[PDB]
Amino acid sequence: PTLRETLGRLAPGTPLRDGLERILRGRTGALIVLGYDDSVEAICDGGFVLDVRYAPTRLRELSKMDGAVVLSSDGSRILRANVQLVPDPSIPTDESGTRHRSAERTAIQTGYPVISVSHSMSIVTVYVAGERHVVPDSATILSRANQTIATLERYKGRLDEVSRQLSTAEIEDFVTLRDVMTVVQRLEMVRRISLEIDADVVELGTDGRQLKLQLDELVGDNETARELIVRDYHANPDPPTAAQVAATLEELDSLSDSELLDFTVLARVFGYPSTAEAQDSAMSSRGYRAMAAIPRLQFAHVDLLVRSFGSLQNLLAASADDLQSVDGIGSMWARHIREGLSLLAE
Amino acid sequence: PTLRETLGRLAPGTPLRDGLERILRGRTGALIVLGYDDSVEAICDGGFVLDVRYAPTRLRELSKMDGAVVLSSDGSRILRANVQLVPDPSIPTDESGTRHRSAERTAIQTGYPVISVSHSMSIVTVYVAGERHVVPDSATILSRANQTIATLERYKGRLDEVSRQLSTAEIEDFVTLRDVMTVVQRLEMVRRISLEIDADVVELGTDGRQLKLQLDELVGDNETARELIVRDYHANPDPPTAAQVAATLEELDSLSDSELLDFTVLARVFGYPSTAEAQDSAMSSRGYRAMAAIPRLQFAHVDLLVRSFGSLQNLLAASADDLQSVDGIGSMWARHIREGLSLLAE
Amino acid sequence: PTLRETLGRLAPGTPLRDGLERILRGRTGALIVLGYDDSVEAICDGGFVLDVRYAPTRLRELSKMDGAVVLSSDGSRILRANVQLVPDPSIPTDESGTRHRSAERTAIQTGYPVISVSHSMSIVTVYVAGERHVVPDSATILSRANQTIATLERYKGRLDEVSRQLSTAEIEDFVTLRDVMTVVQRLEMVRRISLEIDADVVELGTDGRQLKLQLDELVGDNETARELIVRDYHANPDPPTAAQVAATLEELDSLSDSELLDFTVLARVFGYPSTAEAQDSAMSSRGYRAMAAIPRLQFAHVDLLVRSFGSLQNLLAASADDLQSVDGIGSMWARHIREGLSLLAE
Amino acid sequence: PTLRETLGRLAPGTPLRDGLERILRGRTGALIVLGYDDSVEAICDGGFVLDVRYAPTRLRELSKMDGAVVLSSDGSRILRANVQLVPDPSIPTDESGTRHRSAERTAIQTGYPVISVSHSMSIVTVYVAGERHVVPDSATILSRANQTIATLERYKGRLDEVSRQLSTAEIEDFVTLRDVMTVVQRLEMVRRISLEIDADVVELGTDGRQLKLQLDELVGDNETARELIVRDYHANPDPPTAAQVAATLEELDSLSDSELLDFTVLARVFGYPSTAEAQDSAMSSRGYRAMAAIPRLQFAHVDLLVRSFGSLQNLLAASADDLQSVDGIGSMWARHIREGLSLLAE
């Protein structure tokens, strides 16, 4: 199935890695296959059947019978052992060594994991989804995670300073395309780095029970800010809806970093002029990003206010009772809203 | 056992940190209990009795015994090593890792901090008073301090320009509540950030011997200015005494940011009408700010002059021998005071 | 060899550090010792005699041969191997470990550079001058140097602005004690930080071949600035001489920072009324400071002009040809000085 | 502390051997000094004084502290750990290596064994009594033990068939010195090889608990045969007394292979003319061996009858009453003696 689900099960703490480390410290080989179907049974021959509940020591001891062990897809039922796996000898494989050739060919024929641990060494190999992947030690994972994290707060500092510059320019509004789109591309690139580090966090699983904590405490409200900026900044006669936001996010994720750093591509994702003067073109915020800072506000009334106003300049020039004129808005609530708005203009 | 005393005890330069860094270079784990008592004895079982003076080499060598190194109360006497810990497991535990769980359980059992270093990773944790913390590398804390120092100079410059404007108003006295109170409003935050950075400075201890001098040069006379502004800018029948000043500053430190960003809450803090028009209310300064800059001036003379005058206008308009007629004021001493007042009139 | 000459030989690029690195990558012990006296032979035993030219591989192999290698005092010819460095047990040593205890006692008995690399780690150790210095990886050195560069460049900024203010004031000279020695305090601070970064670059050697560029670009003229300020400003009836200037320089260097931040001590080093009533005392500039800005001008001319004038205000009031009236001065040559000095007023 | 007592103490089953195997499985070093005298205390310095009860796990843990582990003289307490071994360097040595030279010097300075288990290696070394012994794997010990038990059993077969031939020639009243003392020739060398087997068995200890019973069932009665033959076949006026028999035993044991393989030397040990005619000479027998095979006999009665008769011919010529007429001999025993003698005469 999915590589970043079999690796997730292959995260430490899970019983599978308990068995794997038991095998590794026992200084012996292993050939573990997860799952059972018609094709797995059809290929595997010359092996016993156990039909017992998975335990950490069953795998460790059963690996010693000089053969492959076939499991249940949930890793619960050990229903085959000692078996030689004899897949189609026509499937192309590049490994050298009968153990690894069999592992790769079986993983190609049936998509289930075929984990191989070479004897006399400490190497764990995963053959999921037609990609070989040596299991690395936690030291290298943590080291590369540390470098990526450091570069991540570098990105965070840059993005935060650009965002605060945008906020300052907005609260005395004179806003062009360049600053907004630089904010957008910084947000997209920090999102990409966040996703990569999240994949690394999934790979760690539980040994590094701090990387996701640092991601939460550093990246923060990335997705909410992304949604707000997409809903606000979109060149359409009317503000986009949730479906349009999702479509724009999909388009942004589809384009690569080369298109991410290209201003024209980001312009045409929302839909902007492609001329060099578009970057010099100025526009006013719909207000979503600016007034999102006010707490205890529901999105329905936010959208209603945006529809009733249209631009952030209208809200800035709104009278004391102008907000009360909007449907569904009370007197004290609107008066309490202006208290936050008033301090922002300072 | 407060957190910000074990943090100081673990600061670089202290021999305990030397032992810790040697252990870190050893690529092996640690389990250090900075205290022994009857509860520790109940937990402790199956170990050696050493009673040797502390040495980073000795600590590094003992930390290879796969157990617990039980230092004395002050962390200067090794008492037990290779001691297995059997704390009560009924108490809640949220740590991920048997060693960390046992260490936290022991720290809950007795009021002694416990430090654990994971095997093959350079992490270090503190379990003081039930609080979980990770001691970070000098690079991260130095970067954080450098980042916050910029906001420190920004706050100091804002307070400086506010104070200069206030003094320019004073020489042609016309005082409103907002102008006379924004100085304290900035003083509170600058002192809060000063103490926040000083916590990091004392955490460094000796490694970051530049942040201490930076805070020395940047904070300046923040405390004296705060005390004098409390003495002067308070609408009370009589100038505040030492007890009154202490109570008011304690109230100022008690209030949170929600009680700080609003000048009106601060107005109730000093004691003022809660009406909005009170922001435009006027009052006569005691005169501390203008004449506090006179060189070779004792605070007792300042307080006596404030008590005998009660306003800055009387001091400014004081005649040549008006100050000399005040009891305890000599002839030459009185002349020098008026020299500053006449010069400051520009 | 001094401590900061052994560290220089142990700086990267040097052949000895190359051999140390080859040993470190070889993951094997090494006990390399430098020098050849009667005591080195009287302690070493159990080894061969070679007399072949030094190379990066000879020490590596003879260290792989599980013994201590002895080297010529210049580290150029190898004449022992395999030796067992056996000093007396009378010399105290708190290290735990036979190899390192032998290295420490060897260094104490014979003040020579003995290198004690431990296997299973990447640690390089030297026990010279009564202390052991763990040679650090380039990362930590670069980190601390980069941290120091920020403080030092802030210091150059403070010096330049304070000194420019003092020079502009001295154009219409009215001198106060605090104003005349704040410049000296800041100059001594920047000198001390320059020396500290010099120690860092000495221990760094050639991997960080950029901090020398930073210092050369930044500090520029500091020792000449100290010389000029002491020569121009030194209250004593006879003109200060080179010996007197140097003596004052090491007198300043002898002062502690606690002694540096007190104006009384800095005054009595130069020689001033130490009373608190001399803070407003003023004196005329001797002529070194302001007039030293003239390009293509020798120091002997400066000294003879000072002898002819003895002050700077009289130079300001000097005519255009009285400079020519000075011995050894022509007309057109003197016209250059007056034009430059006149432009110095603004 | 003999070599073949500490070798036995190191044999499997002994807790010391269990601790040694625990250390070996841990792939860590050990420098274990079996004993604690004031000289050892004068050599051991720089460590922890423990004085705890011995346990294999305690030894395994202490061996990780990278030093010397001094056990008590009987190997019951671990009373020093991580102590430095600084012996007298004036002691001559042939080893080359700090551990292997310091161990030998400590062994020479005080005769206690110094077991060294070099890390990452499976080798165990013993330095007892001034020679070096390497503790071997049990497989080689069993291999050599069986290889030599085979030649022992073939020696025993030749010995007892020659003894049967001697008995057959003995009951004819003709005696030749060569036939008499070739049995002693066989017996001495069989005793030597038996001592070799016993040394191998002591080295094994408990793993090879089959060689001991193999010895007990092959060597059979050897000391009794030796003492009986030396008491019977000796050229002296009267049969040797217990002290005389014992002295002849050590005289026989004193000679070496080159002298045992020579018939004349062994004859001279008995006491005989140097001529080869003595080999052809005929002597009377004391009858000890001939009638020693009779069951239910008392040594005192055998000695009394031999003294009263002197020769086996007198035993043959003795009547039923004559044996009973001898004091201390019963009537039913007298006929039984002849009954066995009559059977032996056939």
Side-chain angles (χ1 to χ4, degrees), chain A residues 221-246:
Chain A
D221 48 352
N222 195 14
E223 296 299 329
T224 67
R226 190 154 297 108
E227 209 278 339
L228 288 155
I229 195 167
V230 165
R231 184 177 293 274
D232 198 302
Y233 301 143
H234 210 282
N236 313 120
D238 47 351
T241 66
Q244 216 283 332
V245 163

mmCIF file of all heavy atoms in Angstrom, chain A residues 221-246:
data_model
loop_
_atom_site.group_PDB
_atom_site.id
_atom_site.type_symbol
_atom_site.label_atom_id
_atom_site.label_comp_id
_atom_site.label_asym_id
_atom_site.label_seq_id
_atom_site.Cartn_x
_atom_site.Cartn_y
_atom_site.Cartn_z
ATOM 1 N N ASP A 221 0.049 28.572 13.239
ATOM 2 C CA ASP A 221 -1.187 28.586 12.456
ATOM 3 C C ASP A 221 -0.894 28.822 10.972
ATOM 4 O O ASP A 221 -1.276 29.829 10.377
ATOM 5 C CB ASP A 221 -2.132 29.643 13.010
ATOM 6 C CG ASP A 221 -1.445 30.976 13.232
ATOM 7 O OD1 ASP A 221 -0.204 31.036 13.095
ATOM 8 O OD2 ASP A 221 -2.144 31.963 13.542
ATOM 9 N N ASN A 222 -0.201 27.854 10.372
ATOM 10 C CA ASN A 222 0.145 27.960 8.959
ATOM 11 C C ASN A 222 -1.083 27.788 8.072
ATOM 12 O O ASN A 222 -1.307 28.574 7.144
ATOM 13 C CB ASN A 222 1.209 26.922 8.607
ATOM 14 C CG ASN A 222 1.871 27.192 7.275
ATOM 15 O OD1 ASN A 222 1.734 28.278 6.711
ATOM 16 N ND2 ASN A 222 2.594 26.204 6.761
ATOM 17 N N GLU A 223 -1.894 26.764 8.347
ATOM 18 C CA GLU A 223 -3.009 26.448 7.460
ATOM 19 C C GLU A 223 -4.120 27.484 7.560
ATOM 20 O O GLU A 223 -4.730 27.845 6.547
ATOM 21 C CB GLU A 223 -3.549 25.052 7.772
ATOM 22 C CG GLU A 223 -2.552 23.935 7.519
ATOM 23 C CD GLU A 223 -2.111 23.856 6.069
ATOM 24 O OE1 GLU A 223 -2.915 24.198 5.175
ATOM 25 O OE2 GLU A 223 -0.957 23.452 5.823
ATOM 26 N N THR A 224 -4.412 27.961 8.772
ATOM 27 C CA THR A 224 -5.436 28.990 8.923
ATOM 28 C C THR A 224 -5.029 30.273 8.212
ATOM 29 O O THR A 224 -5.846 30.901 7.529
ATOM 30 C CB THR A 224 -5.699 29.263 10.402
ATOM 31 O OG1 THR A 224 -4.538 29.861 10.989
ATOM 32 C CG2 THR A 224 -6.017 27.967 11.130
ATOM 33 N N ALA A 225 -3.764 30.672 8.357
ATOM 34 C CA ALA A 225 -3.273 31.850 7.651
ATOM 35 C C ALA A 225 -3.323 31.644 6.144
ATOM 36 O O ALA A 225 -3.661 32.567 5.395
ATOM 37 C CB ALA A 225 -1.851 32.179 8.103
ATOM 38 N N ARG A 226 -2.985 30.439 5.684
ATOM 39 C CA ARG A 226 -3.061 30.135 4.259
ATOM 40 C C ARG A 226 -4.485 30.282 3.742
ATOM 41 O O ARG A 226 -4.723 30.910 2.704
ATOM 42 C CB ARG A 226 -2.541 28.720 4.013
ATOM 43 C CG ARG A 226 -2.340 28.365 2.560
ATOM 44 C CD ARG A 226 -1.284 27.287 2.421
ATOM 45 N NE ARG A 226 0.022 27.736 2.882
ATOM 46 C CZ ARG A 226 0.607 27.321 3.996
ATOM 47 N NH1 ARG A 226 0.024 26.446 4.798
ATOM 48 N NH2 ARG A 226 1.809 27.794 4.312
ATOM 49 N N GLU A 227 -5.451 29.712 4.464
ATOM 50 C CA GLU A 227 -6.843 29.814 4.044
ATOM 51 C C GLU A 227 -7.313 31.263 4.045
ATOM 52 O O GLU A 227 -7.998 31.702 3.114
ATOM 53 C CB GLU A 227 -7.731 28.962 4.950
ATOM 54 C CG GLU A 227 -8.985 28.440 4.270
ATOM 55 C CD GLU A 227 -10.104 29.465 4.244
ATOM 56 O OE1 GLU A 227 -10.077 30.400 5.072
ATOM 57 O OE2 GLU A 227 -11.008 29.336 3.393
ATOM 58 N N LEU A 228 -6.952 32.021 5.083
ATOM 59 C CA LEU A 228 -7.373 33.415 5.160
ATOM 60 C C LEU A 228 -6.789 34.233 4.016
ATOM 61 O O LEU A 228 -7.498 35.028 3.388
ATOM 62 C CB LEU A 228 -6.966 34.011 6.507
ATOM 63 C CG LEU A 228 -7.763 33.534 7.722
ATOM 64 C CD1 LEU A 228 -6.933 33.670 8.989
ATOM 65 C CD2 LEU A 228 -9.070 34.301 7.845
ATOM 66 N N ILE A 229 -5.500 34.048 3.727
ATOM 67 C CA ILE A 229 -4.864 34.829 2.674
ATOM 68 C C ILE A 229 -5.420 34.440 1.309
ATOM 69 O O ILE A 229 -5.589 35.293 0.430
ATOM 70 C CB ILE A 229 -3.329 34.687 2.748
ATOM 71 C CG1 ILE A 229 -2.645 35.773 1.920
ATOM 72 C CG2 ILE A 229 -2.863 33.319 2.289
ATOM 73 C CD1 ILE A 229 -1.164 35.897 2.188
ATOM 74 N N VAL A 230 -5.738 33.157 1.113
ATOM 75 C CA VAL A 230 -6.324 32.735 -0.156
ATOM 76 C C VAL A 230 -7.720 33.324 -0.322
ATOM 77 O O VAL A 230 -8.071 33.827 -1.397
ATOM 78 C CB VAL A 230 -6.338 31.200 -0.255
ATOM 79 C CG1 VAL A 230 -7.255 30.746 -1.379
ATOM 80 C CG2 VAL A 230 -4.929 30.673 -0.475
ATOM 81 N N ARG A 231 -8.536 33.278 0.735
ATOM 82 C CA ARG A 231 -9.889 33.818 0.647
ATOM 83 C C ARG A 231 -9.875 35.324 0.425
ATOM 84 O O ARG A 231 -10.688 35.850 -0.345
ATOM 85 C CB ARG A 231 -10.678 33.471 1.909
ATOM 86 C CG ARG A 231 -12.129 33.918 1.861
ATOM 87 C CD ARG A 231 -12.885 33.480 3.099
ATOM 88 N NE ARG A 231 -13.036 32.032 3.166
ATOM 89 C CZ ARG A 231 -14.020 31.356 2.588
ATOM 90 N NH1 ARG A 231 -14.964 31.968 1.892
ATOM 91 N NH2 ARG A 231 -14.058 30.032 2.715
ATOM 92 N N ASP A 232 -8.965 36.036 1.089
ATOM 93 C CA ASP A 232 -8.897 37.483 0.926
ATOM 94 C C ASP A 232 -8.376 37.852 -0.456
ATOM 95 O O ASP A 232 -9.067 38.511 -1.240
ATOM 96 C CB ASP A 232 -8.014 38.091 2.019
ATOM 97 C CG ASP A 232 -8.241 39.581 2.195
ATOM 98 O OD1 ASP A 232 -8.065 40.332 1.214
ATOM 99 O OD2 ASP A 232 -8.594 40.003 3.314
ATOM 100 N N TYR A 233 -7.165 37.419 -0.780
ATOM 101 C CA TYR A 233 -6.475 37.849 -1.992
ATOM 102 C C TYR A 233 -6.820 36.886 -3.121
ATOM 103 O O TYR A 233 -6.241 35.803 -3.230
ATOM 104 C CB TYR A 233 -4.975 37.923 -1.738
ATOM 105 C CG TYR A 233 -4.630 38.874 -0.618
ATOM 106 C CD1 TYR A 233 -3.603 38.593 0.267
ATOM 107 C CD2 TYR A 233 -5.359 40.036 -0.424
ATOM 108 C CE1 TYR A 233 -3.291 39.455 1.299
ATOM 109 C CE2 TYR A 233 -5.057 40.904 0.601
ATOM 110 C CZ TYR A 233 -4.024 40.609 1.462
ATOM 111 O OH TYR A 233 -3.722 41.473 2.489
ATOM 112 N N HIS A 234 -7.779 37.285 -3.956
ATOM 113 C CA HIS A 234 -8.144 36.507 -5.137
ATOM 114 C C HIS A 234 -8.861 37.451 -6.093
ATOM 115 O O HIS A 234 -9.939 37.956 -5.764
ATOM 116 C CB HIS A 234 -9.027 35.323 -4.766
ATOM 117 C CG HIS A 234 -8.866 34.145 -5.674
ATOM 118 N ND1 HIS A 234 -9.441 34.084 -6.925
ATOM 119 C CD2 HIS A 234 -8.206 32.976 -5.507
ATOM 120 C CE1 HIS A 234 -9.133 32.932 -7.493
ATOM 121 N NE2 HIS A 234 -8.384 32.241 -6.654
ATOM 122 N N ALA A 235 -8.273 37.682 -7.264
ATOM 123 C CA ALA A 235 -8.841 38.640 -8.205
ATOM 124 C C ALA A 235 -10.084 38.072 -8.875
ATOM 125 O O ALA A 235 -10.002 37.483 -9.958
ATOM 126 C CB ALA A 235 -7.808 39.045 -9.257
ATOM 127 N N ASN A 236 -11.232 38.244 -8.237
ATOM 128 C CA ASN A 236 -12.516 37.830 -8.772
ATOM 129 C C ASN A 236 -13.539 38.905 -8.448
ATOM 130 O O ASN A 236 -13.350 39.687 -7.510
ATOM 131 C CB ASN A 236 -12.975 36.486 -8.188
ATOM 132 C CG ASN A 236 -11.885 35.441 -8.203
ATOM 133 O OD1 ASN A 236 -11.487 34.932 -7.157
ATOM 134 N ND2 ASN A 236 -11.389 35.118 -9.392
ATOM 135 N N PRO A 237 -14.630 38.978 -9.215
ATOM 136 C CA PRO A 237 -15.710 39.910 -8.849
ATOM 137 C C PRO A 237 -16.258 39.665 -7.454
ATOM 138 O O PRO A 237 -16.695 40.616 -6.793
ATOM 139 C CB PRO A 237 -16.782 39.664 -9.922
ATOM 140 C CG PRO A 237 -16.129 38.882 -11.006
ATOM 141 C CD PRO A 237 -14.771 38.436 -10.576
ATOM 142 N N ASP A 238 -16.246 38.422 -6.985
ATOM 143 C CA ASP A 238 -16.690 38.070 -5.647
ATOM 144 C C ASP A 238 -15.622 37.240 -4.954
ATOM 145 O O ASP A 238 -14.855 36.532 -5.614
ATOM 146 C CB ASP A 238 -18.008 37.284 -5.690
ATOM 147 C CG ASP A 238 -17.984 36.163 -6.710
ATOM 148 O OD1 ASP A 238 -17.023 36.101 -7.506
ATOM 149 O OD2 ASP A 238 -18.925 35.342 -6.716
ATOM 150 N N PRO A 239 -15.540 37.315 -3.628
ATOM 151 C CA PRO A 239 -14.554 36.512 -2.895
ATOM 152 C C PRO A 239 -14.782 35.029 -3.121
ATOM 153 O O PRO A 239 -15.931 34.573 -3.223
ATOM 154 C CB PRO A 239 -14.800 36.900 -1.430
ATOM 155 C CG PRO A 239 -15.419 38.254 -1.504
ATOM 156 C CD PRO A 239 -16.265 38.241 -2.742
ATOM 157 N N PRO A 240 -13.711 34.243 -3.208
ATOM 158 C CA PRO A 240 -13.864 32.813 -3.493
ATOM 159 C C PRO A 240 -14.471 32.059 -2.320
ATOM 160 O O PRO A 240 -14.438 32.500 -1.169
ATOM 161 C CB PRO A 240 -12.428 32.350 -3.766
ATOM 162 C CG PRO A 240 -11.577 33.317 -3.016
ATOM 163 C CD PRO A 240 -12.300 34.636 -3.058
ATOM 164 N N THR A 241 -15.038 30.899 -2.637
ATOM 165 C CA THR A 241 -15.666 30.031 -1.658
ATOM 166 C C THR A 241 -14.685 28.945 -1.221
ATOM 167 O O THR A 241 -13.506 28.952 -1.592
ATOM 168 C CB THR A 241 -16.949 29.431 -2.235
ATOM 169 O OG1 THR A 241 -16.622 28.550 -3.316
ATOM 170 C CG2 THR A 241 -17.868 30.530 -2.742
ATOM 171 N N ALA A 242 -15.173 27.997 -0.418
ATOM 172 C CA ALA A 242 -14.311 26.933 0.089
ATOM 173 C C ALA A 242 -13.794 26.048 -1.039
ATOM 174 O O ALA A 242 -12.626 25.640 -1.032
ATOM 175 C CB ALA A 242 -15.064 26.097 1.124
ATOM 176 N N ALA A 243 -14.652 25.729 -2.011
ATOM 177 C CA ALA A 243 -14.224 24.893 -3.129
ATOM 178 C C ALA A 243 -13.134 25.576 -3.943
ATOM 179 O O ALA A 243 -12.156 24.936 -4.350
ATOM 180 C CB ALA A 243 -15.421 24.546 -4.013
ATOM 181 N N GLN A 244 -13.283 26.879 -4.190
ATOM 182 C CA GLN A 244 -12.249 27.617 -4.908
ATOM 183 C C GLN A 244 -10.954 27.664 -4.107
ATOM 184 O O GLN A 244 -9.861 27.585 -4.680
ATOM 185 C CB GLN A 244 -12.737 29.028 -5.229
ATOM 186 C CG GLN A 244 -12.263 29.555 -6.572
ATOM 187 C CD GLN A 244 -10.817 30.008 -6.543
ATOM 188 O OE1 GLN A 244 -10.304 30.416 -5.502
ATOM 189 N NE2 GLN A 244 -10.152 29.934 -7.689
ATOM 190 N N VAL A 245 -11.057 27.795 -2.783
ATOM 191 C CA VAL A 245 -9.866 27.790 -1.937
ATOM 192 C C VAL A 245 -9.145 26.452 -2.049
ATOM 193 O O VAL A 245 -7.917 26.396 -2.192
ATOM 194 C CB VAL A 245 -10.247 28.104 -0.478
ATOM 195 C CG1 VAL A 245 -9.127 27.697 0.468
ATOM 196 C CG2 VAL A 245 -10.578 29.580 -0.320
ATOM 197 N N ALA A 246 -9.901 25.354 -1.990
ATOM 198 C CA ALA A 246 -9.299 24.032 -2.117
ATOM 199 C C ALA A 246 -8.659 23.847 -3.486
ATOM 200 O O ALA A 246 -7.571 23.270 -3.598
ATOM 201 C CB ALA A 246 -10.349 22.950 -1.862
#
